């Protein structure tokens, strides 16, 4: 037998490479992204591991870099770390909004360095720290806040990760695939589907749904230090609103430096909230419970409870709705024991945002004029786990787990076109 | 289609070599990816050239097959196995084979020069 | 017959690619530019379109990027947006310079944050806005001004655009070529000639001249919304001067931050101006009129008039002369009706420059010590058009039209070396 | 000179193939231009290789000419036409021809392997 | 080893051509260095291709040796000299030789086409 | 005879290319640097020239770029250029430390723009200029100072310069090689050894030692305008210390902007110094003198003297020890005439550092808590030269000469794989 060299062999190895963006202002720079066939591999079985997938780490770095890039030309707001003289906006409220809005007076800079202006602004209580009464912004002892540009949208736009020549992305089409192990039905694509960079905690919004059944995914289902990602078969609709009509004002704080702030409220002051149907949520939890019993025991009591503690960003359901940042209390959703019409979640609004669990950078989100309403799909959950009873609680804050919930079915492989095999052919 | 023959036998997949061959060849990520794709393509083409296979997809050589690399017969390798399984069984001998190929082609060029001088 | 493959075929297609700089401190970074054969195509006819030529868009982006890059290490001048206390520099002048120079007092910063200095500076009235009398700089409500570095020259240096391997630049040598359509005499070059990035409005300076006859070029000669570019056969000499002897002073405004300003005037205060010979201008207009009659009718009355309105940057002839920015009134040049010794244009000087028709960026041009004189060639005109009478007016402000006047004869093409043709040769 | 034969007939221009071939191969613009020039060169070389033309400027093949692509005779094509006019007349069939070329070379390599095994 | 034959005679060093050939092929410095290494490799491969030497390390041609380039005999060149000394003695004729090589290969391809048309 | 083309020919030419880093926070960014065979050329003689070696210029540009990059995210310290009210720290000292430390009071900024704080800091007298007594920092009239990040180490880490494919680095192994001329023993490497970027003047620390004998290297040994680099056969140990126990304090000067400063001294105040053994230094000088006699004459008197003048950075032995910048007086080392137990060098400490002989950039080095001691090897000298007597003095300040002392044995060459030679072989 003789050694015969074959070039163009359909063989590959696991690889980590640089992926590029394809898409169909906007914080994710989809205009720099290039403009956007699935081939089934009939007898290919491929081993996947969603927990060691470098597409998640690349997506994380890309989303953070795009976020930071969108803030470079925006107003720095250095003059805002001054003493504020604050009172309560509406002293006659007896609702949950009592004390939530502060009417703060301060001396702001102007276009000319030798002139000052007196400004009255409304701030949410979560954005100020008490030193009328003296206050400072929460960021003044840790970071400077940059004002988001009012012209730059925060709406997720689908991003397709395309691989370069010489590499391919394998997709797992097994409806019961749990994110790890052998996949008997694999196809090759060069670009994943469009994944929206939705940023949220506890509840995964506007993502992909499971096919036939709810899917529990965990790096180690018996390690209580790991998160459990739950992919739902059907969505749960969540209707979120900021019912007050907020009037936005603007002042000049330097040459070409405009500061946008919350000016007034037209009409009644009401608490922001989200509505979830009780029957849909209860059916959803029953489905999650059956799938958890499959791993924890058919006779185990499964309990849901509110987040045990930590920063507001992880103890609440955090999301961006219409440009405002909502922090919704989900203790009404995770409060049940499973043995053998509307639900209303109160929400707080914040304007000073500390993204990506970083310290030293902060953003000021300018207010949105009018009344905000948005409707989203809850497509999955992030749960943590604490005998005969197991307790599950909302988790989150590490956005990579939100992206692992979409990239779990993709793997990047390097093509190895050179093969050698014995034949009867001799070179002459 | 690209990699469509990946699950097929080694024989059948040998007739789709042009399909994979044609597929071997934010701005900073795209630039770095383009440069690395070019380097991988050229590295494989250089290996083909030094073995005397610069213009071929199927290239027969003068290096004999050593039964210690694989003791399977041709019907087992070509009718039952796919190329992924074959690459996995003999991956540990890849560098041995390449070295032998490099020596044989170089020796052949010497003989060609020796014959053209007569 | 058999298919034969030919590699190295002299064939090309229209293409848009990245061009690089070749040349023989300076704002255009000719030191990063690399150091700098014309082959006639005897039977090649090529269709050109100067209005869809991507070399102009690339030149525009390159000139703006180089301009902005030259200002990054220069003094920011943030302390200058203060209230100014201004009076008239020379209350006894009865010339056109009365009220043109303001003697402004202000409190400027120093090397130490706890110390201030009182500064008297001269400003042109076009650089200040009245709030002695209170004034502010014109930029203080729109942008911050960066001081140009006194060591960085603004003198145009020829730039050659060279194409990369695989691409070629085709040059049209037809003396009557109007910028569009078939060109019967085409040659291939890899690098264009050196094009000086001269920035001006209304009058094109130091450019290329027509060969045999004046050439009228327009995207659509019957669309009054388009500009008419006129290439002259012979130059008209323009002698511009800033006759006063200006004394430049300097103060420190921070650690290593020096501010250069207009200190005093030695001798008489006189108005800046440009001299054009009346006979040369009249002959030039007669030539323009004959070429316009060829498009508008032999019996049409052709009228020239001053710019109808807009910002000073477009209503005057704007140019940089010796480092100063001149805004010359051309109403003495465009004031005639064509039916069937020196001319003196008054000029204003400005130090706060808003380049490239942008808002949000501004430059402060430090003053030039002494008396300025420069002599330029007027090589073309930019005209706009408003029965039996047609009226033409000066236009400009979009610098791409200044570069279209030099790049009109060049096209970038991609080489397509693979050809297929029938032959009698069969592979054996 | 480079492209000097562009206005010449297809026959005459066939003897200047090395002239254009040698010409096929701020800092960021130069870097991106260099990378894209390399990718175009390699893409054309890959097409020549897969057709069995990796080392030739004039390469004869075993794909017959289909009269539906062009019904001109050889004297019209080679003595009257230039390569620019020819590329314009048959540009719409370029991808058909390339596919046929790809199939024929792959088939030829199979037969070569088949003959060397005897 | 790489360049180990640099001090050896031209004959002996002719059997190590694969050793140097395999070695011909902060982030911005690495990227620019990778791109320039690729361009140099391809420029040398293009010169080999246009001379008809695209797949060879030792390539014999039909260009005669002109005694004005070097009047040394073969034993002096191959048994006494190293390649560094040889490149130094005839560096001034490198571009003359390359031009002749370019013409001969192009002429040979014409004749091949002429013979396959019969 | 026929022309035969050979590809893979072991031939090269002199070349200048881009080299990359290989290594095994830290100011030299060794994490961006990639992870790290010497082949003897038996009959290769290669001409070297250490004075025209572009590896030194590339190393210089790389070290400066890395240094500057490490300061971009650090505190700007703009508020520090204020009037200081200073007194003497320890009025009762009668040692060399009298007047060396100033106790300076100033009004510093805080996290809120409307609030100030009164701060007492200790400064070395070399960092302040007198205007209690009024002082300013030495940088306030030339540059802004950036605080070095306390988390970024200044400890030299070996850097290996690796060449790209197509290039090779030739190493000269001749023990008596003087940096120029033919080298009869040459080997090829692709990466040099690890060269530590040690920054110092007058004395070369922690470098390479000569093999058999001391080596005098000079671009032109008879040109008194050139420096003489001396490579020693054996090291001279130098023990340097900052014996006082300094207490470091910190204040906030803005949102997230912490200022670190020299707070107090625990125990006695003592002068920093370096210890060199007298016998070792005298033997070292005797060796240098014999090698100088070989070039200047066996009957010439060789004199050593202290640096004649200039900035402290070049008149003293400047080095970084434990994070502090030492300026040691070497007049006790260079004070001898050569005809036919501990030595103690006093040292000054500075916190405001002007690196790489540049003007316009300055760094503030935060103080190091506690007592500093370091032991280094003196591996070479930088000497300058001013009849029958020659006088040599310490030189330095141009760091390229420190790197020439390590890169003198390396040359970069381009591989030229295409050769042509006559043979008897004719193409068929
Ligand atoms: C989930 O998707 C929905 C629909 O795309 C988002 O709601 C829309 O948001 C845009 C931007 O504010 C509005 O113009 C649309 O009117 C909204 N749709 C509806 C039906 O109200 C929703 O914001 C997304 N959720 C998240 C977290 O991004
Ligand atoms: C047109 O070209 C002329 C000549 O190159 C320019 O005038 C020169 O400008 C430089 C720089 O100020 C002076 O040193 C020369 O003495 C000038 N020449 C003369 C004859 O005075 C002129 O500035 C150019 N016009 C424009 C708009 O750039
Ligand atoms: C020369 O090398 C020595 C040893 O590597 C350096 O001294 C060490 O410095 C580090 C960092 O401060 C200390 O942790 C070690 O304890 C020191 N070693 C000893 C023995 O004290 C010395 O600083 C280097 N010299 C220069 C100029 O960089
Ligand atoms: C603004 O500054 C003045 C002093 O000029 C002070 O009296 C006043 O209280 C300040 N206002 C606020 C809201 O801090
Ligand atoms: C996922 O499936 C694998 C078997 O392929 C199993 O070992 C693992 O425990 C499963 N994990 C979860 C969370 O379902
Ligand atoms: C999973 O977690 C359990 C409990 O922490 C541990 O004993 C087991 O080894 C883990 N498995 C793996 C594969 O790490
Ligand atoms: C939620 O339901 C309440 C009634 O319980 C209704 O008043 C409110 O408007 C609803 N909000 C949304 C956002 O659906
Ligand atoms: C909010 O207030 C604006 C007036 O500022 C009004 O035009 C708009 O209709 C209001 N929207 C709602 C939902 O009340
Ligand atoms: C804040 O307080 C001031 C003073 O009491 C008042 O004039 C202003 O209207 C208040 N702001 C709002 C939004 O009511
Ligand atoms: C929710 O999911 C349904 C499919 O079940 C889809 O039609 C709908 O558009 C989704 N809603 C959002 C807001 O994405
Ligand atoms: C997959 O295997 C079956 C045999 O089980 C075979 O018939 C089929 O052709 C294979 N698919 C491919 C793409 O080779
Ligand atoms: C400078 O500031 C003082 C107040 O300290 C003021 O009286 C004076 O008018 C100012 N001068 C100018 C020119 O504005
Ligand atoms: C330019 O010439 C073309 C003919 O080639 C003509 O159609 C067009 O109108 C002309 N335009 C001008 C402005 O001369
Ligand atoms: C030129 O302008 C005229 C008048 O606006 C218009 O009718 C004509 O269609 C235009 N021609 C083209 C080619 O756009
Ligand atoms: C313009 O002409 C006038 C005479 O009318 C003369 O005084 C002046 O100096 C001239 N200026 C220039 C710049 O030629
Ligand atoms: C301008 O004034 C300076 C004195 O500052 C003098 O030396 C120079 O000659 C003057 N130039 C003219 C043209 O008057
Ligand atoms: C500006 O005015 C001040 C005060 O009247 C005067 O001292 C100064 O000289 C004036 N500036 C000039 C340039 O004359
Ligand atoms: C004006 O054009 C003539 C050619 O007609 C040329 O010699 C002269 O140098 C030009 N002047 C300038 C300032 O470019
Ligand atoms: C151009 O055409 C003429 C015939 O009209 C021909 O003689 C000449 O050679 C052609 N030029 C080229 C470069 O082929
Ligand atoms: C070096 O030269 C000697 C003859 O002096 C020879 O024997 C030896 O092989 C040469 N070395 C190499 C590497 O060719
Ligand atoms: C701080 O500022 C006050 C004025 O508010 C001044 O009296 C005091 O002397 C300053 N202190 C220092 C140390 O400069
Ligand atoms: C170095 O050696 C060369 C001879 O190779 C000699 O010409 C030169 O003067 C020497 N220089 C020194 C400083 O030793
Ligand atoms: C070395 O320096 C001496 C004295 O300056 C000078 O005469 C000699 O020419 C210089 N040698 C070289 C090679 O520059
Ligand atoms: C320096 O002082 C600290 C107390 O701040 C003490 O713990 C440490 O041991 C002292 N070190 C020396 C060398 O005296
Ligand atoms: C500096 O002086 C002040 C006032 O005399 C004193 O309180 C402080 O302790 C001194 N600093 C030190 C380090 O002794
Ligand atoms: C000094 O040199 C000796 C070798 O002579 C070495 O062992 C020692 O580690 C060196 N010291 C330093 C600090 O590098």
Author numbering:
A (entry chain C), C (entry chain A), F (entry chain D): 34 to 57, 66 to 77, 82 to 141, 150 to 184, 188 to 309, 312 to 323, 323A, 324 to 397, ...
B (entry chain E), D (entry chain B), E (entry chain F): 521 to 545, 571 to 663
What does the paper say about this structure?
The N332-GT5 molecule was designed to engage antibodies containing a specific HCDR3 motif (derived from BG18) but bearing diverse VH and VL gene segments. N332-GT5 was designed to induce diverse human BG18-class type I precursors. We conclude that N332-GT5 consistently induced BG18-like type I B cell responses in RMs.
We employed cryo-electron microscopy (cryo-EM) to determine whether N332-GT5-induced BG18 type I BCRs engaged the N332-GT5 trimer with a BG18-like binding mode as predicted by the sequence analysis. We determined structures of three BG18 type I Fabs, each containing distinct genetic features, in complex with the N332-GT5 trimer, and we also determined the structure of the unliganded trimer for comparison.
